Design a protein around this ligand. Structure first.
Ligand SMILES: Nc1ncnc2c1ncn2[C@@H]1O[C@H](COP(=O)(O)OP(=O)(O)NP(=O)(O)O)[C@@H](O)[C@H]1O
Ligand SMILES: Nc1ncnc2c1ncn2[C@H]1O[C@H](COP(=O)(O)OP(=O)(O)NP(=O)(O)O)[C@@H](O)[C@H]1O
Lengths: 248, 94, 265, 265, 248, 94
């Protein structure tokens, strides 16, 4: 009943009333840049630092498996092609739904609590087209770039393990092997997942803040509701996308 | 600091502080304590707190359990003040 | 027209707990009216209802003629440029400071030049009083200064109906006095018709020209601040001075007190 | 002893913004005293300070003899069994219902049997009034019923000093009246010595026997509710009736109004 | 200065004053069970459902790599020994810091805001020894069990891919190969990481709620602060633990 | 709805609504508009809003920029009311 169609229809309506409408551009450009700084630039530290660690692990736990199979040169093909096909777009979606997927619901649900959104709508300004949409377009263009930064630092960390720790190969690691890895179709299959996860993370991270019960115990339950659903949906959409992108 | 009840005929002469602290020993044998006691006299009781008032309520209820018209003598003014606070009906305290 | 908003017969539900039931209200222009009820009576919903932000179930609420509920939602913004809610907690935008918080409805609608808009905002701040707080962020403001800054931001555009949702709630009498002098000086200088919904009677009745009192789910009394404090009606006579016991029950309903006292007697 | 808490000379800082500065206060037992100041004056910190939950920088606060600040922190719990803060918002435990919320300090300390504790709690609820709300969760309660349930939970153990942190703030006069009748009926029935800190003067002075008024960072006036409303002192005469303009400045400080009006004249 | 020692010393003090003290047992047993239901049983759905998806992926993206190397029998050794050595204790720590690592700070920081903790301390009851400690011991004994449930359902999902999808092996998948995998030392090396991550997640998820600025915009910033730090620290402690557990 | 300013000697006879809306065209040539104008007469002005008051402030300031003792005639009572609200000093409005 309730979750049957009420919540989904309302969470789709708050988006069809937040993207399609007046084509205002040069009034939102000052908002889109600040929302890029909030949702995209601030969160960068949580995806750079946690990009090296999930990188250095990916090498250190992989280097000790390939070594048993006498193929330590494929390490670059193992680190990159893993944190660029599966782990990149999903780990940087989880760490996004954490840092910038809850700071959105704890923000646009905190506005709704202090009657900030209704005070916007009490002018002529639409609360959706002015508060939702800048944050939405800041979410769906910062995540597909955050995953790129995350994959870059992940490959650098994998190098820091498979090169700086066990100095067996300085250029055989990536200068020769990753050339057969870093091809276009792989980055495309990574960016598709990054964009779909950006949409799904920042749509249910921007709806729980808009559909929260306006109280300190309603926004703080919706915050965790986004961190939960924006991990369930990330993993589920990841399985579906992987079935479609490699199950052929 | 002290509490002691004596069955002295038809009277339950209890004396002490009758509060949340010294209330324990009286609660156990409450049945035999009010077995054949018609009126309960709480005169040598310095003060009475809410817990002691609850225990007194239960003692009265037990006196009426087997069937006995109970009466209270020697009570303080402070006890009836505290009972007027809690809006205790006149058919449970008398 | 005579009155600026005539709520003829509004019935609002909000689920199952019927909030209002065929109420009638009439704010005359230039007059600062007030509506009072117990806490949690639904009176803020009345303000949110006369701003078109929520629909009456069976109601004809006429803001200066045409109905509010039957509006294109594109015309409703044009008339909503002639209203101004002053919520509790101010509803100040935490992004920008006070200056960019008062200037917001100006930049949104009017094409005032930059040095013109600066002089307009730095004048409305002096009107309210917190002109030195132009560059202070709205999370640095006090609890009462937030309502004052939101008032300055609310009188931008000269809205011809600025309604106050509990402007003095949990405020010291010294800031209650500032907030009761501001929203009287405005009505006596501008032509705004303040609708002050509240329940802090001693201060609201000091300015209200014609106040309503709404009981559980309907309006029970109206009249001026003088003919109201003499009303011989228990539901109103209790609330007007808070006698703590009357038609509203002091003791929450309970069962027999005896099984509650001695469970299983 | 004469007075139940004698705060001889307390100076509290909290960082750099010096809150208090050599203040003196004396709550006599059996007397319901009050302290009033503007909002954000630091008066709730005074209550949190006489409960030992925060230390005075240079202060001798004597709760019935021995100091509160110089306590083992194991003895402080024994004396803290003789205090009871009633915070705003009630501070009700959202886990358990009202019944298990009033019974909490009982089960924590006393060994009352189950049918004894049930009769004690279902009596303190009737004392406060919300006995029918025994099984209602504290998030289902109203805004004023939460303070009443927390009062019932606060008078458990008969604390001999139950201090109220703004018990009537943002409440209708009809619930303000219930809350002002409860905390007078308690003092006139129990021997509790209520310390009602607040700023809603018209209602607090209706019961307070000896009230203090603290200015910016020090106590400026005291005396009974009668000798206070006649005090000839601007800092006190302003607050006692809220004249909106006096020793506290209405206009927040600003610069010259001219460069603010015409930037770069 | 501030983060130098003030925050760490305070976050260690709020724990040394929350575990060592009165040895009260039978008064906390009614609290420990309810905190196990809140922090451990409620979160189960987010680690079962997101255990299958991270499982079915681990097979589906791994089955298509082993097949290129003609070794499709090692799939059980690939799925299990991966989501039981590296991915299990870390993904179920991230999904824990999400569901039950923010619901703790949005709860024990919401209590502190409504003056619930100071109202406890206003009785004789210590707020730490009575509110912190039950939640702490519910966190550090629900996570090492949630990771076990998560690994179990992950292996089941990996089977659902490598068996139900491509019905190549029904018993060669795990009935023969995983016997050389599921050995004791592996589960021990998984439970060690699960316990250290439980301690680190629920110690900084229980401190941000205790050190939050008590306001709807303070608890909602501390909530995201835990979801960030309880992913940075999980990944970092994971790298350190993997270096110590396999870098030998 | 309308606004029009005429330089008619030493007087700036402006007539209209002088509010946030019709204010644009006058703001641009404000310099030459008050070039040789001693007193500004706003008599045929129905109402005046806050923005119009700001523009009038700036026109006065410009009249004093090149140096000219300005005076206001034909102003309404409502304008001086609104100016008493904003606490406009007596040396900027006259
Ligand atoms: N944790 C804190 N750190 C520093 N200063 C504080 C803190 N809590 C309160 N203060 C300051 O202490 C003073 C008084 O405290 P507060 O309890 O806010 O005052 P109050 O007016 O008595 N309470 P209330 O009106 O109910 O908000 C104010 O200047 C506060 O800013
Ligand atoms: N979605 C909702 N569902 C149910 N009640 C709601 C909802 N939104 C607001 N309310 C409340 O609105 C009604 C009117 O009270 P409310 O709007 O909270 O303000 P008030 O009671 O007039 N004053 P106050 O709450 O002190 O600001 C209550 O009876 C509640 O129903």
């Amino acid at each position: 009943g309730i979750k049957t169609l009420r919540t989904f229809g309302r969470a789709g309506l708050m988006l069809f009333n937040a993207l399609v409408g007046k084509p205002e551009f040069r009034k939102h450009a000052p908002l889109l840049v600040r929302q890029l700084y909030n949702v995209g630039v601030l969160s960068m530290l949580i995806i750079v630092v946690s990009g090296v660690f999930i990188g250095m692990v990916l090498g250190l736990q992989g280097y000790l498996v390939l070594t048993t199979y006498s193929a330590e040169t494929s390490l670059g093909m193992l680190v990159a092609l893993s944190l660029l096909r599966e782990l990149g777009p999903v780990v940087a979606a989880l760490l996004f739904a954490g840092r910038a997927g809850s700071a959105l619901t704890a923000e646009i649900g905190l506005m709704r609590a202090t009657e900030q959104l209704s005070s916007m709508e009490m002018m002529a300004v639409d609360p959706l087209r002015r508060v939702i949409s800048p944050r939405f377009w800041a979410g769906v263009i910062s995540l597909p770039l955050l995953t790129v930064i995350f994959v870059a630092v992940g490959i650098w960390g994998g190098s820091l393990v498979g090169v700086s720790w066990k100095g067996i190969d300085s250029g055989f690691f990536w200068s020769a092997m990753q050339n057969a890895v870093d091809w276009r179709m792989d980055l495309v299959n990574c960016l598709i997942k990054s964009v779909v996860f950006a949409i799904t993370v920042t749509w249910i991270s921007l709806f729980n803040g808009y559909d929260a019960i306006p109280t300190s115990a309603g926004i703080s339950r919706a915050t965790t509701r986004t961190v939960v659903h924006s991990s369930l949906a990330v993993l589920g959409l990841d399985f579906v996308l992987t079935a479609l992108m490699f199950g052929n | 600091e002290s509490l002691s009840w004596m069955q002295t005929g038809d009277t339950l002469a209890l004396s002490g502080e009758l509060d949340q602290d010294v209330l324990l020993p009286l609660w156990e044998m409450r049945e035999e304590a009010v077995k054949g006691i018609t009126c309960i006299d709480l005169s040598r009781v310095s003060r009475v707190d809410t817990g002691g008032l609850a225990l007194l309520l239960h003692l009265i209820d037990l006196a009426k359990k087997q069937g006995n018209n109970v009466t209270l003598q020697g009570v303080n003014d402070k006890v009836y003040t505290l009972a007027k606070l809690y809006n205790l009906p006149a058919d449970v305290l008398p | 027209v005579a009155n600026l908003v005539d709520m003829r017969d509004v019935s609002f539900t909000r689920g199952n707990r019927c909030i209002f039931d065929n109420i009638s209200l009439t704010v005359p222009r230039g007059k600062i009216t007030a509506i009072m009820g117990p806490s949690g009576i639904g009176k803020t919903t009345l303000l949110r209802l006369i701003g078109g932000q929520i629909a009456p179930d069976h109601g004809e609420i006429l803001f200066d003629g045409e109905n509010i509920p039957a509006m294109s939602r594109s015309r409703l913004y044009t008339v909503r440029k002639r209203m101004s809610m002053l919520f509790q907690s101010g509803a100040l935008f935490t992004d920008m400071n006070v200056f960019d918080n008062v200037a917001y409805p100006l930049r949104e609608h009017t094409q005032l030049p930059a040095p013109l808009l600066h002089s307009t905002v730095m004048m409305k701040l002096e009107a309210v009083g917190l002109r030195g707080a132009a560059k202070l962020m709205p999370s640095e403001l006090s609890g009462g200064m937030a309502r004052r800054a939101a008032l300055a931001r609310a009188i931008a555009l000269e809205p011809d109906l600025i309604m106050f949702d509990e402007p003095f709630v949990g405020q010291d009498p010294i800031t209650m006095g500032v907030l009761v002098k501001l929203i009287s000086e405005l009505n006596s200088a501008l032509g705004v018709t303040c609708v002050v919904v509240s329940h802090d009677v001693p201060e609201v009745l000091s300015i209200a020209d014609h106040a309503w009192i709404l009981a559980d789910k309907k309006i029970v009394a109206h009249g001026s601040a003088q003919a109201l404090q003499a009303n011989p009606d228990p539901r109103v006579r209790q609330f007007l001075d808070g006698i703590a016991d009357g038609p509203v029950p002091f003791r929450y309903p309970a069962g027999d007190y005896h099984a509650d006292l001695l469970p299983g007697s």
